[PDB]
Structure 1
Amino acid sequence: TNQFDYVKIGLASPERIRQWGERTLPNGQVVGEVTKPETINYRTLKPEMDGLFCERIFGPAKDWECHCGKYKRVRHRGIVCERCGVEVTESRVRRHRMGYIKLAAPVAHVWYLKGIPSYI
């Protein structure tokens, strides 16, 4: 409503998708990626490090709680798990963050490829 107006669309681009995904943090450092397959450990029930359901780079699970632990209550608004990558809010921010497999090889997109038109 008002805030939005009209939707352009173009070929996306790494270096451009390199503008979102990564979220440098005042650990002073640089967070975006993922690297290693994962859901949570079995025994505990929460993602891991990288981890496809990350509780750090991705955010919370139990709402306002650093994977480092020692994190309860909420009101904080910048927390960065001192010693972990937990930056809590509501467990909502988690839904609004992406990462990337970072293809070692320059793979091409099937959506041009055998594409009915096959633009490429």
Structure 2
Amino acid sequence: KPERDGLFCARIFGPVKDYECLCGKYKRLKHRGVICEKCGVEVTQTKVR
């Protein structure tokens, strides 16, 4: 998985998977558009990256 603040990252660029966060806490469609409690990434498609 990407580093916290390395070259590859999620909270800086976007989720590495479509509608799936890095921690797997938010994975359904209801949480689409909200950030998690530690990484704080807007869960969405990979195109954002």
Does TM, normalized by the shorter one, top 0.5? yes
Alpha-carbon separation, structure 2, partners of 1:52 and 1:87: 18
Q: Residue 92 of structure 1 aligns to a residue in which SS? A: helix
Query: Larger radius of gyration, structure 1 or 2?
Result: 1
Number of residue pairs aligned between Structure 1 and Structure 2: 49
Q: Residue 72 of structure 1 aligns to a residue in which SS? A: coil
Q: Which residue number corresponds to residue 43 of structure 2? A: 88
Alpha-carbon separation, structure 2, partners of 1:52 and 1:77: 25
TM-score by length of structure 1 reads: 0.34
Query: Deviation digits for residues 34-79 of structure 1, max 9, x if unmatched?
Result: xxxxxxxxxxxx2111111102221111222222331212354421
Identity among equivalent positions (%) equals 73
Q: Which residue number corresponds to residue 65 of structure 1? A: 20
Counterpart amino acid of 1:66? C
8 Å contact 1:60–1:91 — kept in the other structure? yes
Alignment gaps of 5+ in structure 1: 1-45, 95-120
Runs of 4+ aligned structure 1 residues displaced above 4 Å come to: none
Alpha-carbon separation, structure 2, partners of 1:91 and 1:78: 14
Task: Evaluate the alpha carbon distance shift between residue 52 and residue 88 of structure 1 in structure 2; reply closer, same or farther with a 3 A threshold.
Answer: same
Alpha-carbon separation, structure 1, partners of 2:22 and 2:34: 12
8 Å contact 2:16–2:22 — kept in the other structure? no
Q: Which residue number corresponds to residue 29 of structure 2? A: 74
8 Å contact 2:17–2:45 — kept in the other structure? no
